[PDB]
Every structure is written in C-alpha cells, then in structure tokens.
Amino acid sequence: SELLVNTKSGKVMGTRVPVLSSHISAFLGIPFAEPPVGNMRFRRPEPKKPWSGVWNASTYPNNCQQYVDEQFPGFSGSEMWNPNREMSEDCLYLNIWVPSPRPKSTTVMVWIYGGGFYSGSSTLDVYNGKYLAYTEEVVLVSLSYRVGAFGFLALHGSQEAPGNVGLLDQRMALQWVHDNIQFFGGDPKTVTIFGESAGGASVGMHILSPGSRDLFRRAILQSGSPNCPWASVSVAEGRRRAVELGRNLNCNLNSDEELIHCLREKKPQELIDVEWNVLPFDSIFRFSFVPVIDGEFFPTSLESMLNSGNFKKTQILLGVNKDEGSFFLLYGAPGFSKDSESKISREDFMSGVKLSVPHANDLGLDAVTLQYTDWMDDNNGIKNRDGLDDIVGDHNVICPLMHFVNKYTKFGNGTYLYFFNHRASNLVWPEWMGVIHGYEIEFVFGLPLVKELNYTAEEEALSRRIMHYWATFAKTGNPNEPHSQESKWPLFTTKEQKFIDLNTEPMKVHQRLRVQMCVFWNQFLPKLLNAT
Amino acid sequence: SELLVNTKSGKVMGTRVPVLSSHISAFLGIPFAEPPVGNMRFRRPEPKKPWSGVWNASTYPNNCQQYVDEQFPGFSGSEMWNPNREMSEDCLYLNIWVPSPRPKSTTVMVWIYGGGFYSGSSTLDVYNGKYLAYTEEVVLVSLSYRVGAFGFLALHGSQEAPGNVGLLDQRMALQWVHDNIQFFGGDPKTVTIFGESAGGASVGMHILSPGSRDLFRRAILQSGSPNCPWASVSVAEGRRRAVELGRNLNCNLNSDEELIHCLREKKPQELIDVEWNVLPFDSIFRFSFVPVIDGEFFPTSLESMLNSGNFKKTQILLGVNKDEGSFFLLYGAPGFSKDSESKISREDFMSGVKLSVPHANDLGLDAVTLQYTDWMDDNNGIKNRDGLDDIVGDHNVICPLMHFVNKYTKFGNGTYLYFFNHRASNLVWPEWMGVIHGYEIEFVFGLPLVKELNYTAEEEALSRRIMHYWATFAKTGNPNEPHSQESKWPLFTTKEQKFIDLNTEPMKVHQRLRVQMCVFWNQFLPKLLNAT
C-alpha cells in the first residue's frame, strides 16, 4: 500500500488527500523527537524512541504552546496565524506530502514556519503543502519546533535550560529527514530548507551553524535573516529575561537549578501570560525568547562569521515584501487601527519612532527622523504613516537581509533576490497595510490555485511562477528553467546587485534594493550609536 | 553748478558721467575717515577732519590693501574682482552717483562690497552705480572698508587692535551718509543698505549691532548672512590667529603691545604674503581675519540675539544663487579645474568633504556623505561633482541664510526671499560652475543694459525687473509696484515660507527653500558634533 512506509523509527500509515481534483499521499503528525515534557521542559530534544506497529499519521499533530492573538476575534487575517489544533508541550512532529505514485528519489523541500519565535504552527491552512507537492512534484516536509520560553529560555552554562533548544528541534527534524526521507521517495542529497520571518532567520541560522550545515543542500529565506535585530540576543540578555520571567512568577531566584525547577512546575499558560513582560524596552517587532548567541550553536558572533566566510557555501534564494512593517505598527504603535486609514500625527510619529528603534538615544531618533521625513510636507498624515511603515520594515527585515545578502554573496555559489510587491485582490486587511509581512506565503503554497478562495487568474499565474521558481531552484540551484521564453531572473552579484519584482506585471529587473536607506541602517546609525 | 556740493566736511566737486546715452552726476573718492596709517593701523577709524577749498571727487579712490588673485592671469572672470586702482592703506572713501537734475529728497541705496573680508573694492566695473542711479532715480552710494589683517586683526581687550575695525569703517561711512547725503538730494530717512557675500553678512551684522541700527531704514542681503560660519570667529580664535600671523613674521610675541608694534612696522605686503598661513584647518570658504564676536559690536552671541529678537526690526529682502559653492571648489578642492568638466572621483569627493567641513569628526563626515551621495549611482563623477557643489553652497551660504530668515521673520516687519538661478548667456566660467556666487550682482547693477557687453534681450529685461524690485523695495519696503499686471512677489511668512525664482522665465513661486538639507545643516549636524 502506497500509504504504508517503513522508516528507521518504525512503520507509518498516512492518508490519501484530494488536491486540485486529483490525489496524493500525506503523512501528518510523525514524531521526530521525544515529547519534551516534565523535567525535559527547556532541555535539548532527544531522538524519538523507535516504535513497533503502525503510527497513525492521518491527522495533523498538536501545535506547540504559545501566545494566541485575540486582537481581532474571528477575523480571518488574524486567526489564520493562530493554532488550528490543540496546544501541547507534546508537539515535536513533522508532516510530509508525497506525490502519487510515490517517486523514487526526488527534490525535497522543508518548511520552517515563522511567528517571531513566540508562535507558529506546522499545521496552518496557509502552509498546506499538498498544492506544492502535487504541482511541482516534490516531497514537501513541514517541521515543528518549540517557541516561546519553552523553546528559547536561555540560562547559559547550565544543561537544563541551555537556550536555542527550539533550533535543536529544527535540526533534529532535518536529521530525521536526512535519515528517513528516502523511504518517502525523497532524495536526501537534494533537500532545500525554506522559511518566512523567524523561519527565514532560522534558515540562515542553519547555514551559519556548523552542526546544521551538513543536513541540507540549499536554502530559501523569506522576509527574515539570521542577523535581524529581533532574531537573537546575547547570553547576558537571555539570562536577564529568563530571571525576569522567574521574578514575574514569584520564583526562587537564588540559583539556576532553583529557578528552572520553579519554571518547570508551572502550567504552560502561566509562562505565556507574562511572556511579554520581560522585554527590556517599550518596543515593536521584538520578542521575548529568541535564539541566544551561545558560542555553541554559533561558534562566534553572527557578524564575524559573515565576514570570515564561516558559513555553508551553496545557492540561496531570498527576498522581502513591499510593506514588512505595517503588521507590527497596527498592533503596537499608537495611531494605527484596522478600520481607519491610520493617518498619523506629529506626536504619534515620534512615538512610533521611539518604539521602532528602542536602543536609539535622542540623537539616534533625530537621525532616523531626518531620513524618513519629507520636509516639504512634514505634517501630512499619510506620509507620516507610510514613513513609519518603511522605518519598521527597513530596520527589521529589508536592511538586515540586504546585509546578509551582500556578505553571503562574496563566498556563496549563487544568490537570487526578489522584492514581492503584489497586493492580493482578496486581502482582508486594510489598504494602508500594503503588501504585508507574511502574505507572499499563500502564493508560495499555491492557494491562488484553489478557485473557491477568490484569487484572480493573474494571481493563479503568479503563484504558479513562484512555486515553479521555488521548486526548480530547490532542484537545481537555479529558479530558471533552461529553455523558457520567459525572461531570466538574473543572479545577484556583488558588482551589479540585481533583483526582480515578483508581481502580476511582466518581469522587470532592478538593482541595489534600498541601498540608501540600508546604508543608513547598516553603516551610519550603528556607528552613530557607538560614538555615543 | 550741479557738480558742486557743500557737505558738513567741506565742498566737493564731482563729474558729469555718461550713462545709456544720457548723463548724471558722480562724486568719486570722498573721504569719510582719516587715513588709518602708521600708528593707526589696526585702530578704530576716526572721522575725517573737515577741509576748506574743493575736494576733487572726479576719480575713483585707491582700493584697500589686499590679496590679489593671480590664479588666472588676464582672465576676466577672475580679474573682474581684483583691484582696478592702486592699493593703499589710505583707502577709506565712498562714491556717490546722483541723478540729473539733482533730486531734493529721494531714496538712498548704499552698497557694501564682498570679498570674504580679505578683499574687495568699491570701484569695480561690476559695482558701477550709474546704471542703477539713472534707471531707478536713486542716490547710489558705495562705501569702502579695511579688509584682511588691516581691518580685522583682533587682539581683544586692547585698544590698538580691538578687532572689527573694518565694520567700524562701514558704520562711519553710514554715519557720513546719514549726516551729509541730504546735500546730494538723498533722503536720510530712507536709506537702504545692500551687499553680497561678506557685504551681505555685513548688512546682517549692522542689523544686529546696536551701534549701527539707527543709521539705515532697510536692508538687502545677497548670498551672505551674519551667522555664516566663515563670517566670524570667537575672540580666542581672533587672538590665536593674530599671534600666529606675528609668529609667521618672526615678531616678538611677549605681549600685545610688542606684537602690534611689530605688525605696524611691516610693509602691508608682508602681512598679505602670509595671511592664509594662519587658518587653523585645511579648508575652503574660510578666511583669515573676519569679524570677532567681541561683546561690544555684538552685545551677545549671534544665535542668542536672533532668538531674543535683539535686532533691528524692519523690512528685509534677500536670497541666494543656485550654485554658491562652485567658485571655492575650483580654487581649493582637488579634482576641480577651469577647463574641464571636473568629474570628481571617489577619492577627490572624500577630500572635498573634509575640506568643506573642517570641524567635522569622522562621524560628521559620514553624515554629510550620507546626505549628498546618490547610492544608486555612487561613483558617477558628475553627481560627485554636483554633490560637492551643493555641500559647499548649502553649508556656507544657503542654510545659514535660511536660518537667519526664519529667525528674523518672527520679529521683523516684512521679508521677501529669492533664489537666483539664471546662468548668463555670456558667462566666461565653465558650465559646471553653474549660477556662480557673485554673478547676480551684474544684474542688480544693470550691466545687461549696456549693449556692448553682449547680454540677451531677455537678460536686459531681467536686470530691469531686478533693479526695479531692489529700488522699489528700498523706497517702500515692498519690491512690488502697487498696480503691475506682473504677478506679486509674495511675502515670506513663517507659516508658508514662500520665495521666488529670479530668472528669464515667467515668475514661479515656491516654498521652503531647501528645508531638508538645511534641517541637516542647522539642526542635526551641529547636535551630532556636540554629542561627540
């Protein structure tokens, strides 16, 4: 039977699922680790103990414990990112979508979800890998990993809560794929990791981390890169926050053993209820428990690794969206609302700048303000609104990724860069939010192919282009098909720095994605803050 | 006889001069002070001792001792600014152009020449006041004043070389006008001072200085304002340079008396030969001996006076040219030449920035560079060239004048602002130099009316518009004639900040002349350098 597969861990039984009036195999909720429960909370994951008999892999697994957004109850734009399954600490599972008939040795793609390291699920509608598996004839894997304190509490020097264990979850899932995907028709030699937001940052972190480098061939990073300021913290910072969490729960702080014991006795929701209280600044686009720069997962600082060329050298494909900042301004910045144009006053602009750049001294704030203010028309609410959007997106996503790109490309074996700037015809969010952080994903997973979802024909076409790029790149290291009459997506070179717009218009090629602003964020401002 | 005039100092005999095939009276080389010679070098000027008999005022007076530009021997563009008469320490004279027949009580305009406080002459072709006197029916006066060490050596606390004596020359000439111009048909109640470059800065300095305020009604400032960074120095800086001059001439430095005695024994040319050696920085658009902020001529710092409203409250008319920087880059900055396009490399750009902003620390240089570099195309020589031009003009002229304007306008009785951006059809300088510092003057003095000088008809018309503006403003406080079908040159208000282009195209009105760049120069950069 096509739905029965013997892996080194035991037999698994999947399910036949429909897709675009055809069918493929699906194996949902396969365990790649022991459940990290009780005295294993905060610890590194252990490999799943093999099982006899058949694992029922016909339903999605539980989602990991996490914050649940209830800002807009019942609003699809908001709810589409929340857990659709029940939450559990027992959550280290992966899902596999296999074509039918089963292939022998084909290209593998492994999805790492986003959610700012505090949230995320392998099981969301928007990450249903059947469309991609079916259309591009690839084995699509989506892994899971612990988020929040559960995955990233970091008391360095201790083995009970070392930090980064969420990233170790990810790696173990990749180990399992390396070891077992051949039984699903996957080719372990040709595995591509891809992710968005924290998943994109995670992808870049597996490129950097020596322990992870050998378990994949290529990488795709979507609106995330390992050097993003929200994506990691020093071990001293991990320590401060870990203790501050403990302090918020009236824990005994006299030692690491006593603090961890206290944090382990708690019900998960008691940790989630105060998670956000530990941030050291009044900020946006910052999350409480993120990867620590521990000297283990990362031999040295991210920046020195990028300079030295200390990272996996292969092909990468990556890019960003037109309006990466808007989501975070809506939630955290005064002046912004879901149901208004959100024209921003003088006062709310200054507030939003402080919030966007929490380490910036008075002078740093003047510098940002000077960069993003139209002085001809400096009290226009639309320009103020759009300026903050750009500030947040440039600082947190675009300019960090552009630094990564310029650094990686000096040593890598091929880079392809995109700017996704199509606003979906069916987008539930207001127009001022633009091309939103996260909303390229639905195109990458083929949702525009499903006709009851209400996308345009031009949008179906765009999704097909994108899926084919992604797949063809996973397979060959180049998103272009050798013959196509369609114009070539050019390589990104240090010298010419070419990228493409991804939208419904015929492909236009550009150069130097946001150089001026990114010179400010990457070179000038840091140096400004260092001199003060 | 129309050419004989009794003044409180004695009778003077002028000359009938031709002008646009008509004639008017001219009184050239009238003394307003004692010759500041011998033991009076560096001292405040004394009033001219009255004389019996007739003063022959039929020829131009000597020019004051000064540096002579010989960068381009015989080049009219260069030579037009050098002394056309013999140089002498005996140089405190003024010239008067009177209409014919003599008026009874008409509007007076008093020209204060530029030259960076190190040079200048009342007697240059380009400042021939006959065209203006004749066309607008005004009494036109041009004064003179000591430049260089001779006029601005500043050993504060001593009375032999107090500093600012050049400005006292200017004031005494204005005293003389106040006292005696009625005899020439001038109205002392309606005297307008106007000047360019250091003359414009001088005009603004007489607005600020209590001792000068009562001697004029209105003011025009052309490409100069009192707060320009090149226009003044602290008393400690005046002292350092004075001593450094002395040191360059092997003078005894044991005291002020001994140093001054040494400097007084020298032939003037020995002081001029080393004048430039005393600048404390490798710089451009900086001059050795300029007005000191002495607490006497200026009761307090320029900035606090502007804030408090401590200045004469009246009408002002002022503005700047499109390309104020080019002249100085040609002379001082590597890469720039008279006979090339002067496309500027990476290296020469960085050099020019250092030269343009001599007090700027490393970070200050990055900040300027970030502001003026097109990062899309950052190795284009034309953009590099044009960027430096803008840097120099914005920093030294436009942005200082815009600060003055915004500050003055809060307390003043009417401001009118212009941007002169017409390049003369007959300009001898190369095209890359643009609309050059100083080249609006010929329009203000009516040279486009003289047909053998080779200006266009459109240029004659522009000169007539400008002369009429200048005169009509001198007369009424408003450059607009009440009835004219021609569009009104609007008032500059704090709120709307309107100005006009001055060129051959039909008048267009604009707002906020270079806000963005001037926010950088006036607010951000200073604050940056203060925090470091």
Ligand SMILES: *[C@@H]1O[C@H](CO)[C@@H](O[C@@H]2O[C@H](CO)[C@@H](O[C@@H]3O[C@H](CO)[C@@H](O)[C@H](O[C@H]4O[C@H](CO)[C@@H](O)[C@H](O)[C@@H]4O[C@H]4O[C@H](CO)[C@@H](O)[C@H](O)[C@@H]4O)[C@@H]3O)[C@H](O)[C@H]2NC(C)=O)[C@H](O)[C@H]1NC(C)=O
């Ligand atoms: C593709 O396009 C189509 C057509 O353009 C989209 O159709 C939209 O879908 C909505 C429903 O999703 C539909 O409008 C509904 O009509 C029903 C009957 O006429 C209404 O009963 C219903 O209202 C309920 O939901 C609202 C909350 O969202 C409430 O405001 C309202 O009070 C109703 O809520 C009730 O719910 C509880 C529990 O069931 C009940 O006990 C109470 O009575 C309570 O009041 C909807 O208005 C329209 O046809 C379309 N509307 C819009 C705005 O587009 C289709 O959805 C698209 N496909 C996709 C996938 O998006």
Ligand SMILES: *[C@@H]1O[C@H](CO)[C@@H](O[C@@H]2O[C@H](CO)[C@@H](O[C@@H]3O[C@H](CO)[C@@H](O)[C@H](O[C@H]4O[C@H](CO)[C@@H](O)[C@H](O)[C@@H]4O[C@H]4O[C@H](CO)[C@@H](O)[C@H](O)[C@@H]4O)[C@@H]3O)[C@H](O)[C@H]2NC(C)=O)[C@H](O)[C@H]1NC(C)=O
């Ligand atoms: C208005 O427009 C008109 C017409 O368009 C302008 O006319 C220009 O004027 C110049 C002269 O100014 C004239 O060209 C001259 O022609 C003479 C005879 O043909 C030449 O002898 C003369 O050359 C001398 O000057 C040059 C230096 O500038 C030298 O390169 C050259 O070697 C000559 O120099 C000599 O000088 C010494 C001393 O006298 C002598 O002993 C030596 O022999 C020595 O060699 C000129 O070329 C042209 O008609 C026009 N040229 C240009 C470039 O425009 C008119 O000038 C305009 N009016 C105004 C006010 O600008």
Ligand SMILES: *[C@@H]1O[C@H](CO[C@@H]2O[C@@H](C)[C@@H](O)[C@@H](O)[C@@H]2O)[C@@H](O)[C@H](O)[C@H]1NC(C)=O
């Ligand atoms: C495999 O499981 C299918 C659905 O499983 C459902 O969820 C799991 C967690 C259990 O609670 C189960 O009882 C639920 O039905 C079944 O429909 C299917 O019959 C199962 N097949 C086999 C061979 O075990």
Ligand SMILES: *[C@@H]1O[C@H](CO[C@@H]2O[C@@H](C)[C@@H](O)[C@@H](O)[C@@H]2O)[C@@H](O)[C@H](O)[C@H]1NC(C)=O
């Ligand atoms: C007035 O002066 C005219 C020109 O003066 C000339 O320059 C002065 C400095 C003397 O050097 C003089 O000798 C020169 O001629 C004379 O042409 C004119 O005749 C003089 N007129 C009177 C009435 O004195």
Ligand SMILES: CN(C)c1ccc2nc3ccc(N(C)C)cc3[s+]c2c1
């Ligand atoms: C409860 N608190 C303090 C916070 C603070 C910041 C936040 N930022 C977000 C950013 C994006 C997002 N998406 C669903 C895209 C959801 C959230 S939820 C959220 C909740």
Ligand SMILES: CN(C)c1ccc2nc3ccc(N(C)C)cc3[s+]c2c1
């Ligand atoms: C001899 N040295 C050291 C210098 C230094 C700087 C200078 N700057 C100028 C600027 C403008 C100008 N004009 C005639 C407009 C002439 C000069 S001359 C000059 C001479």
Ligand SMILES: *[C@@H]1O[C@H](CO)[C@@H](O)[C@H](O)[C@H]1NC(C)=O
């Ligand atoms: C990638 O590597 C191969 C050989 O290792 C080389 O020949 C090829 O040109 C490289 N391509 C790029 C874009 O670096």
Ligand SMILES: *[C@@H]1O[C@H](CO)[C@@H](O)[C@H](O)[C@H]1NC(C)=O
């Ligand atoms: C100038 O002052 C007069 C009275 O002193 C006043 O009425 C007039 O409106 C003022 N104009 C401006 C532009 O300030």
